[PDB]
RNA sequence: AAACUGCGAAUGGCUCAUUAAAUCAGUUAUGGUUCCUUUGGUCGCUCGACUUGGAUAACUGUGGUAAUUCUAGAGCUAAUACAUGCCGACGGGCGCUGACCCCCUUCGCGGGGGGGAUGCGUGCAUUUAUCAGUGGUGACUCUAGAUAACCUCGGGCCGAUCGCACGCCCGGCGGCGACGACCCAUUCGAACGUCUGCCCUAUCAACUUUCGAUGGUAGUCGCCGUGCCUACCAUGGUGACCACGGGUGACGGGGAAUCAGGGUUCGAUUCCGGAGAGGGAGCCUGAGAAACGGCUACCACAUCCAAGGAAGGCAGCAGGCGCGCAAAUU
């Protein structure tokens, strides 16, 4: 191509959207925004595939242009707006609030949060910058340039912003024994305490993470997010709790739940 | 907003500088204990 | 047009390439500025990304820096003397980066004579008849004459610059790219640099 | 001794014409725990493409090889021998890729056969993308 | 004043092209004898010289200074300006108004 | 309605001609670059008009040519078009300057320490030189800081813009937006590089090199890195581990067919990446094109013609001819 691409093919769409094969040639190409193309979940796919409030993508145009949807504290009217990790979708006329947390499989799930929980969100910082007059700058994983932050906050720490004001309230520092949601790679959706940092000058630093059933696993430090100091998370967690039961144990629990229920 | 947030950071940077200056005294106090060891 | 392509030319091995695509845009050459010494003519060029780039074609002044005591002034460029790249870009007086140009001294001589209050240049025998900078050499207060005296104690300039300030023309090294930014900024040659470039101008002379 | 070009050779950072009444030398640690040599710091050479005393940063790949030619000036040809696995004939074949690599004149005593470590950087020339980081001397050759 | 007209093959005159015959020109946006279609389009139209000879269809003429007599076709007919000023400051200049 | 303005038209679609370390794949880099948009920052940080200027189109009206999505002359009239530009914050800080003046020691000169009229500058961006060593990396000639300046007349920013509901206050002051904008970050990318990997061929064994071959130095150009291109030096670079040249009924890959274990063959073809729009070439506009449902030539073929000229690009969807063993509805 001799400029930017404006279409996304249904087949070339990321697997974690769980778009079917047969409905359309094209997938909703996420608009440019805070989250990456292959790490986001467009508003349309949340609004008509996950929750099924719409039937078509013209229904999603009617929902969003009534201004009933409010992603992380501000009303958007774009059907292909990239809503990503830790974002809070507040559908206000229904009186509902959803956090985009990764399920134990790599998808984003329908995680309903309370109106009090929906007022703050947790943001991993990407870099520390010194602005034009000695002004310290954070940049979060969702492109928030927050200036005059606490000096103890360094890269790979998470900060708790209040949506309404956009100012930091608390922060977890990247230290051992802290909870870690894995937000990239094979372990996408795991939750466990950080047990080891392994430095690599030049190459990528890897981080071993012990789980709530002693299931230790590694991950590239790029693909890591700290969700609470020690063993207490600062968010509410979906069922499975990022523990990742095996396919043999999944089969066992699904079979036990079906036979016992009736 | 510029003046208030600059004044708010000035108070927070002063606090962190005084706690990191207490850590300067603490490292000099460790050096004082090893010199009196 | 005139291309900046890596594909038009042989490999390590000496094997010629068959070209797989026709000249791209971003693989671009624009004709050389070859900027001269004359009344300021600078042509703005649109470049990649809708950003601007100033082709100086004539340029007669420049913000040159006298790095010894860290002063810089807008000074007239009068002659190109030496170019290390091509010997024929001296006859055709083309300003490029790392040219050796004669510039005016009088902004630096003015600064020196106002800051140090000592007669610099000024061939021995003559006076200043307007009596302006003659009065700016004299008539200070108690403690500020002492400030000028403490400054005067360590105010020695090199005999090489003393000679060049006397003729009224310093040697300067162009540091900016007048083809690109449209400016002819640089620094004044001193110490080993000046001795080196005076030796190279002397060797080229005969 | 030095400065044999038509232009004046110097380090760009260090300023050498401060008013008076030995020139100071710019260097840096290259990173990756590779020690800056003595001859880089104490030496009088001036090389824009030295990874210790020049305008070049080592990033990405660190490789090695054997110095095979030293006839180019300020740059050498090394030779990387490896084994490619043809899976049909469940065996290896001996294959080589000789690459032109820049040789910083801080490495004053280098002979052909010496196992040199090289660091990926920005392209210094048409065919050079690698600076020499350290030289380990050949098997024996203490004399 | 001779404002210039059309060739006998219909090709327009062009202000300061400085021939009498038909000449082909690159015409970009901000030229006579051409309107663009795409932005920065620049077609090769053929125009007629500004020097005037018998080889023409029309000459567009503009009466600058009115003569002695009243011409029956033009001057006897009185037509007012179709529209009136819109911007307030042009109204202020026309009616010779104040700022108060 | 039209017309101006803005935006899009660089995606999508089609085809596989070219292309054999090229393309492409995994793998890294961008500390070597650009980036409309989106998202979040910034947007009284500079110390020096209660809203300015005059064109133009639709419109109206005279037309020309055989002819085109050809346009000309005349009468008007809009801006978030093109232009020009102030008030406010604003009262003063900070660097020099430096009149004047104060206090102490000395017989005094002298020594030594404070206030200070006036004038010159000062914000971010651009460009150069210097000095010191807030935050960050494995490492910057990084970020930030300070000094000195410079400021492209073909000219960086600091808002002469529009809409909703409108109120409180002895004319001032205010909510919710839309649009625009320097710069930073983010996103979508794109570009150029790293390591490794390709079919047949020796009836191709030496090739590359003063029309750059491999290096070095300094420039030019470029968005940046680099023989990319100059000038001057050096004589290098590649090769039996198959260079160089040639062929390909060769776009590459994910993949497909067969297949015990190995393999063999295919992959024009819906996804990814590349390339091209009859052949080469050149450029306009734009964030993005060397664009062809953009423009300018040449070569080829071909269409209207009142013979003066004008117009073209189905490897888009249909469809026609031709070609064929071989492929569908204007």
From Swiss-Prot, chain A:
Transmembrane intervals: none
Cellular localisation: Cytoplasm; Nucleus, Nucleolus
Residue(s) of cross-link: Glycyl lysine isopeptide (Lys-Gly) (interchain with G-Cter in SUMO2): 229
GO cellular component: cytosolic ribosome; cytosolic small ribosomal subunit; nucleolus
Ranges for domain S4 RNA-binding: 41-103
GO molecular function ontology, one term from the record: rRNA binding
PROSITE patterns: RIBOSOMAL_S4E, S4
GO aspect biological process, one term: translation
N6-acetyllysine PTM sites in chain numbering: 232
Keyword rRNA-binding in annotation: yes
Cited InterPro entries: KOW, Rib_uL2_dom2, Ribosomal_eS4, Ribosomal_eS4_C, Ribosomal_eS4_central_region, Ribosomal_eS4_central_sf, Ribosomal_eS4_KOW, Ribosomal_eS4_N
Family statement: Belongs to the eukaryotic ribosomal protein eS4 family.
Subunit structure: Component of the small ribosomal subunit. Part of the small subunit (SSU) processome, composed of more than 70 proteins and the RNA chaperone small nucleolar RNA (snoRNA) U3. Identified in a IGF2BP1-dependent mRNP granule complex containing untranslated mRNAs.
PANTHER family: 30S/40S RIBOSOMAL PROTEIN S4 (PTHR11581), SMALL RIBOSOMAL SUBUNIT PROTEIN ES4 (PTHR11581:SF0)
Name assigned to this protein: Small ribosomal subunit protein eS4
Protein source organism: Oryctolagus cuniculus (Rabbit)
Gene symbol of the encoding locus: RPS4X
From Swiss-Prot, chain B:
Residues of the full protein shown: 201 to 237 of 249
Function: Component of the 40S small ribosomal subunit. Plays an important role in controlling cell growth and proliferation through the selective translation of particular classes of mRNA. Part of the small subunit (SSU) processome, first precursor of the small eukaryotic ribosomal subunit.
Provenance organism: Oryctolagus cuniculus (Rabbit)
Record-listed N6-acetyllysine modification sites: 11
Region of interest (Disordered), ranges: 17-37
Quaternary assembly: Component of the small ribosomal subunit. Part of the small subunit (SSU) processome, composed of more than 70 proteins and the RNA chaperone small nucleolar RNA (snoRNA) U3.
Source taxonomy: Eukaryota, Metazoa, Chordata, Craniata, Vertebrata
Comp. bias regions, Basic and acidic residues: 17-29
Protein name from the UniProt record: Small ribosomal subunit protein eS6
Similarity section: Belongs to the eukaryotic ribosomal protein eS6 family.
Modified residues (Phosphoserine): 35-36
Subcellular location: Cytoplasm; Nucleus, Nucleolus
UniProt PTM: Ribosomal protein S6 is the major substrate of protein kinases in eukaryote ribosomes. The phosphorylation is stimulated by growth factors, tumor promoting agents, and mitogens. It is dephosphorylated at growth arrest. Phosphorylated at Ser-35 and Ser-36 by RPS6KA1 and RPS6KA3; phosphorylation at these sites facilitates the assembly of the pre-initiation complex.
Swiss-Prot record, chain C:
Signal peptide region: none
A Gene Ontology cellular-component term: ribonucleoprotein complex
GO biological process, one term: translation
Covalent cross-link Glycyl lysine isopeptide (Lys-Gly) (interchain with G-Cter in SUMO2) as placed by the record, residue numbers: 169, 192
Positions bearing Phosphoserine: 159
Bias-annotated ranges (Basic residues): 7-25
Domain of life: Eukaryota
Entry-annotated residues carrying N6-acetyllysine: 36, 127
UniProt main location, coarse: cytoplasm
Membrane topology label: Lipid-anchor
Pfam families assigned to the protein according to its UniProt record, in alphabetical order: Ribosomal_S8e
CDD domains, alphabetized: Ribosomal_S8e_like
Subcellular location(s) of the protein: Cytoplasm; Membrane; Nucleus, Nucleolus
Any one GO MF annotation of this record: structural constituent of ribosome
Phosphothreonine modified-residue sites: 129
UniProt function note: Component of the small ribosomal subunit. The ribosome is a large ribonucleoprotein complex responsible for the synthesis of proteins in the cell. Part of the small subunit (SSU) processome, first precursor of the small eukaryotic ribosomal subunit. During the assembly of the SSU processome in the nucleolus, many ribosome biogenesis factors, an RNA chaperone and ribosomal proteins associate with the nascent pre-rRNA and work in concert to generate RNA folding, modifications, rearrangements and cleavage as well as targeted degradation of pre-ribosomal RNA by the RNA exosome.
Assembly: Component of the small ribosomal subunit. Identified in a IGF2BP1-dependent mRNP granule complex containing untranslated mRNAs. Part of the small subunit (SSU) processome, composed of more than 70 proteins and the RNA chaperone small nucleolar RNA (snoRNA) U3.
Name listed for the protein in its UniProt record: Small ribosomal subunit protein eS8
Organism: Oryctolagus cuniculus
Curated annotation (Swiss-Prot), chain D:
Key words of the record: Acetylation, Citrullination, Cytoplasm, Lipoprotein, Methylation, Nucleus, Palmitate, Phosphoprotein, Ribonucleoprotein, Ribosomal protein, RNA-binding, rRNA-binding
Listed GO CC annotations: cytosolic ribosome; cytosolic small ribosomal subunit; nucleolus
Citrulline: residues carrying this PTM: 20
Recorded GO MF terms: rRNA binding; structural constituent of ribosome
List of residues that carry Omega-N-methylarginine: 59
Location within or outside the cell: Cytoplasm; Nucleus, Nucleolus
Residue positions bearing lipid (S-palmitoyl cysteine): 50
Posttranslational mods: Citrullinated by PADI4.
SUPFAM superfamilies: Nucleic acid-binding proteins
Residues modified as Phosphoserine: 57, 100
PANTHER family: 40S RIBOSOMAL PROTEIN S11 FAMILY MEMBER (PTHR10744), SMALL RIBOSOMAL SUBUNIT PROTEIN US17 (PTHR10744:SF52)
Function: Component of the small ribosomal subunit. The ribosome is a large ribonucleoprotein complex responsible for the synthesis of proteins in the cell. Part of the small subunit (SSU) processome, first precursor of the small eukaryotic ribosomal subunit. During the assembly of the SSU processome in the nucleolus, many ribosome biogenesis factors, an RNA chaperone and ribosomal proteins associate with the nascent pre-rRNA and work in concert to generate RNA folding, modifications, rearrangements and cleavage as well as targeted degradation of pre-ribosomal RNA by the RNA exosome.
Protein name, as recorded: Small ribosomal subunit protein uS17
């Amino acid at each position: 191509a001799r400029g930017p691409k404006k279409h996304l093919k249904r087949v070339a769409a990321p697997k974690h959207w769980m778009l079917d094969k047969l409905t359309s040639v094209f997938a909703p190409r996420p608009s440019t925004g805070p989250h990456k193309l292959r790490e986001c979940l467009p508003l349309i796919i949340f609004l008509r595939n996950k929750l099924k409030y719409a039937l078509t993508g013209d229904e999603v145009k009617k929902i969003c242009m009534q201004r009933f949807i409010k992603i992380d504290g501000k009303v958007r009217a774009d059907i292909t707006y990239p809503a990503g990790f830790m974002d809070v979708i507040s559908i206000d006329k229904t009186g509902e609030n959803f956090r985009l947390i990764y399920d134990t499989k790599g998808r984003f799930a329908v995680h309903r949060i309370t109106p009090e929980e929906a007022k703050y969100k947790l943001c991993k910082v990407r870099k520390i910058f010194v602005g034009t007059k000695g002004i310290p700058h954070l940049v979060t994983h969702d492109a928030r340039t927050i200036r005059y932050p606490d000096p103890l906050i360094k890269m790979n720490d998470t900060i708790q912003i209040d949506l309404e004001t956009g100012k930091i309230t608390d922060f977890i520092k990247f230290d051992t024994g802290n909870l870690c949601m894995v937000t990239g790679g094979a372990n996408l959706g795991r939750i466990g305490v950080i047990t080891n940092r392994e430095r690599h000058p030049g190459s990528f630093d890897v981080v071993h993470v012990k789980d709530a059933n002693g299931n230790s696993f590694a991950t590239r430090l790029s693909n890591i997010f700290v969700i609470g100091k020690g063993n207490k998370p600062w968010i509410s967690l979906p069922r499975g709790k990022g523990i990742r039961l095996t396919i043999a144990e999944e089969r066992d629990k699904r079979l036990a739940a079906k036979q016992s229920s009736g | 907003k510029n003046k208030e947030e600059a004044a708010e950071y000035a108070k927070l940077l002063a606090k962190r500088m005084k706690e990191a200056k207490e850590k300067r005294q603490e490292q000099i106090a460790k050096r004082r204990r090893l010199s009196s060891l | 047009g005139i291309s900046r392509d890596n594909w038009h030319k042989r490999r390590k091995t000496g094997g010629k390439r068959k070209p797989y695509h026709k000249k791209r845009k971003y693989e671009l050459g624009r004709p050389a500025a070859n900027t001269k010494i004359g009344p300021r003519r600078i042509h703005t060029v649109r470049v990649r990304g809708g950003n601007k780039k100033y082709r100086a074609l004539r340029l007669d002044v420049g913000n040159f820096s006298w790095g010894s005591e860290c002063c810089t002034r807008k000074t007239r460029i009068i002659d190109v003397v030496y170019n290390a790249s091509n010997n024929e870009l001296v006859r055709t007086k083309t300003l490029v980066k790392n040219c050796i140009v004669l510039i005016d001294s009088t902004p630096y001589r003015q600064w020196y004579e106002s800051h140090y209050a000592l007669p610099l240049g000024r061939k021995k025998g003559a006076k200043l008849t307007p009596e302006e900078e003659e009065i700016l050499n004299k008539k200070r207060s108690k403690k500020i004459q002492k400030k000028y005296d403490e400054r005067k104690k360590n105010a020695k300039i090199s005999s090489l610059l003393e000679e060049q300030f006397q003729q009224g023309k310093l040697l300067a090294c162009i540091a900016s790219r007048p083809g690109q930014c449209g400016r002819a900024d640089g620094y004044v040659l001193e110490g080993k640099e000046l001795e080196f470039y005076l030796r190279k101008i002397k060797a080229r002379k005969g | 001794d030095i400065q044999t070009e038509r232009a004046y050779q110097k380090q760009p950072t260090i300023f050498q014409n401060k008013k008076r009444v030995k020139l100071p030398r710019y260097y840096k640690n290259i990173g990756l725990g590779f020690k800056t040599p003595k001859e880089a710091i104490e030496g009088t050479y001036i090389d824009k493409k030295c990874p210790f005393t020049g305008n070049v940063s080592i990033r990405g790949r660190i490789l090695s090889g054997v110095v095979t030619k030293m006839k180019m000036q300020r740059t050498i040809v090394i030779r990387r021998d490896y084994l490619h696995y043809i899976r049909k004939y469940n065996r290896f074949e001996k294959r080589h890729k000789n690459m032109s690599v820049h040789l910083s004149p801080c490495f004053r005593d280098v002979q052909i056969g010496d196992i040199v470590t090289v660091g990926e950087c920005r392209p210094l020339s048409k065919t050079v993308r690698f600076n020499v980081l350290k030289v380990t001397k050949a098997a024996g050759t203490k004399k | 004043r001779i404002s210039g007209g059309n060739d006998k093959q219909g090709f327009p005159m062009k202000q300061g092209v400085l021939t009498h015959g038909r000449v082909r020109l690159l015409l970009s946006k901000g030229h006579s004898c051409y309107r663009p279609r795409r932005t920065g389009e620049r077609k090769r139209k053929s125009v007629r010289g500004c020097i005037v000879d018998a080889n023409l269809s029309v000459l567009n003429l503009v009466i600058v200074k009115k003569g002695e007599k009243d011409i029956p076709g033009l001057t006897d007919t009185t037509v007012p300006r179709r529209l009136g000023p819109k911007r307030a400051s042009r109204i202020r200049k026309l009616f010779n108004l104040s700022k108060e």
